[PDB]
Symmetry: C5
Amino acid sequence: LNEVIRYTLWSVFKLKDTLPEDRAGYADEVQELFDQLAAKDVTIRGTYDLSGLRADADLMIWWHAETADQLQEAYNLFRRTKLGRALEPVWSNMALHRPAEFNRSHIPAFLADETPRNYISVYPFVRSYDWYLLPDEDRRRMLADHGKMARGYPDVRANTVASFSLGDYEWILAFEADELHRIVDLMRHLRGSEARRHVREEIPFYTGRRKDIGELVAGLA
Amino acid sequence: DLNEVIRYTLWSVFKLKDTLPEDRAGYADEVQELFDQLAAKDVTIRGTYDLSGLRADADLMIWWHAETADQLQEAYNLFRRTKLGRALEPVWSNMALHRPAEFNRSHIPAFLADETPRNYISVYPFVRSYDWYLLPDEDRRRMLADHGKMARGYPDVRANTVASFSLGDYEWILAFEADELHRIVDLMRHLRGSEARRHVREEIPFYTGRRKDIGELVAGLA
Amino acid sequence: VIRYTLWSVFKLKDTLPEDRAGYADEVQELFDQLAAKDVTIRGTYDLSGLRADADLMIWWHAETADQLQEAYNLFRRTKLGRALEPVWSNMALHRPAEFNRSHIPAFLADETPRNYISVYPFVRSYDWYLLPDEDRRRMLADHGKMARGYPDVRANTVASFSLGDYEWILAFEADELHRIVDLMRHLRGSEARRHVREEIPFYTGRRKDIGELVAGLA
Amino acid sequence: LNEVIRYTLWSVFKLKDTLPEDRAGYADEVQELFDQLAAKDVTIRGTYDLSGLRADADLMIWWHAETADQLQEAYNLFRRTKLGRALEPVWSNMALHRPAEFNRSHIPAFLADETPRNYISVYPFVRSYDWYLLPDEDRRRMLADHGKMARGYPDVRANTVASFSLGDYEWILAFEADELHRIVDLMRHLRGSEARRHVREEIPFYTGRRKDIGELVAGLA
Amino acid sequence: DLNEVIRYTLWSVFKLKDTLPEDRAGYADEVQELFDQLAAKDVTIRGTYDLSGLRADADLMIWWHAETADQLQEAYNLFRRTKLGRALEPVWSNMALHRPAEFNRSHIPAFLADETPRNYISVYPFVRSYDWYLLPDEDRRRMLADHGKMARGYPDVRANTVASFSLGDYEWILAFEADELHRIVDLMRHLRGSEARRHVREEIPFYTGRRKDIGELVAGLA
């Protein structure tokens, strides 16, 4: 299973303005595309309401597929929908699942049968310049201690997917949880790991409520 | 006790797209109607704030809080449909939620304690050093205690430091309330003398302004 | 005691009209009504060409932040204001100096405005205010005496903690522009340059009557 | 071959909204211009689909000529096509092959005229302030040691081209391979090189699929 | 003695809002007329440069200098009123002023010594390290001398490094002219070997282009 090929693309959009007072068929059209996409092996793990938690983000789409190419096609197809034409691209990064350095049983929840949860917290990651230059023992230790420190939070599901030379980052992280504050306390608790001493960048956070494209479109302004 | 409530707090900053119209008759009223309706659910609107002139790309800040984030999201998009909302671009909207303090569980944000909101506010995000939370518990304790001790001469300035890890780009959203603006000024200058200042990576943007009823605010905006 | 001071920077949306008959008078009218209310318009400055995203600055002060907020919105309603984009607007408030209390901003001591200005924000190092008082006393005394040879450059350094993103806002006015330049360069030799995190953006420009300023702008 | 004066320019664009549904002339009119520029010595090594992998890029052009002025003319002409009047410029940096400091048979894989592969990732590069002040031995060793580390990845072609004072950066980098995941593993593997301690900037990344102009015009939204 | 002259130099960079019309009418000529009128008032226009393609956000540069800042501001606003001006938006406009070099009073920017503009320019701002001006004089004097020596193989590249403290965000504006673009590239990479490289905080954006008469500039542009 450390041998699948799967590309994950999280892509974030913001309303150009408000959606129209009459938005009949906006939701349905997008759902239509989401199904014929699901025909091909392009799965839409979730769409997400990001309104109000960020001023420049309103909608997120999590899709994954077997080639980067299929995602690119999906992205452009969405932008042709009547909804995508009322949105502006904001941030859209792709990552690719690779075997973990040490613990080869570490697997992202979207490749481990796990259910999508109510809330998501997505964000890129970039380590210090000498993270990967460290004596393997030091990095395996900090990476293991850091996983211990989170064993109290199995109600928060992790996706931690390599992204080197797919964009500006080293990793794209996604956290799934039914209770939003459990994500908060996880981050807060993990500020205690020694790994925190080897971080260059973890911005921007996009955090939202997983929703059906029907009520998502109705919720948006 | 209050350290066991779940209260999400949201600060939403807007700027005029350009100017309100000359006749702005329905604008404040329609917004007050929405605020009244949000108050029927437990969506409380602690205040609206005039930020114009104190920052070139901010004119209006709504402070609201509620039991789920979803109600804030709902309230937010509902605001953006009002006539006032359609004259405004979003600029900065960040959510936080009270978590128990680490050492002193009697530290409670003012909005949680149902304190009275004051005439002026300064809201700003906050990010600690990378090694702040890794420092041995004794050293973080006496820097957190010493800094609150330095604030004793300013009881008129009411803190609202709230956790925000993974709600957005920051660790903490801070909101200070006082009836005289220069006292916020004087508190920060004085707190520059606390040793915790050596454990700061980020603390901008600042959104400072005057608390106003929605009718007066909509009248005085360009 | 208690004077708030505001520097408001705008840039053209495009150009002004060819026929700009009303524009300067309308603004001068409002400046006159504000001076009645004790909202002082200390100057308007032409910033064009010296920065691509800035064309005019207004320096106004008053007894409360609120009067300035009100003045700022009134100005954005004029014809000239409606032809502008807000770029950078930051307030400060004088507080008595930490060490030498004769040291006060020029515009409180009522000195005349000079021909040119350069306005910029300031943020000191994280540990500047944690230093022993005698160290900060020495560095402030020394940086100030290095400036003895530039008595033609008037300072206005004004605390701005919690009003916006900065700790101080700085305004230098001199009759010859190059004198500001040489002052800056010479002070790069003060030890206090070791305790700086941020000192941009600079807005530098020519003091002009509002009439002359409207006509010269693109 | 370290004597050839060759300027190479990568030009990134993004859609202003979307192309029209009726895009008949679009892909053809561009392909004409490419034919003319190749009649001069303006080689167009590839067009690339960048969409979805970045929210603010959709199309990259990799061109190169004997003179920088030729590329400037090519650029303004392309911006005159119907496809070009449909794009905002996003990022366009030029570089120029100079001999290597130590190993003069390291030469960009594009003036050793090779084959453009399916996938490219392009990004700028700026070294630490003191990298060039290091004793020649130390910089020699690190560049050599980092070259060894990429032996396992010979299906990935390196172009790394000096850029000093043609723009903000010190080099432009382009990596091309037929299997996208191989660029990913190469970057990750190379984070173990000592030269990682002498890096100040390496972004934005532009990664995408080489495509023929007609196929690319049809794919974009 | 050129050290006692006062000469303000301004580089003004613009990008196209979209693309120029097909019918470029007297676009080139209206601008050339204004340059001539400015030339009459001792507003020298050393060069106009094609930036396009080498930077996605710049197509045109104007290098003009004069005896007062004010004259350059007027030139600038007048240029913006031309038909070409109305088809551009400003990107980056910085002014500088020659002041006597710290140690070697013979170092003089090329334009002030009335040398000939070459085919290619690269312009960029510069900001030194915080302690740069605080190093003991002989450390800084040695480092600048050595950096001079390292440039001796490049006399075909002319330097115009000029003080800009307080005129904008920087310490110096630098402008290098050469007849062959690759000589600039090579000088830069060669000077990375100077010790002064350890005392650098900022040196972007770079605007690098080809010197062109207004007419063919306006014609080659998109």
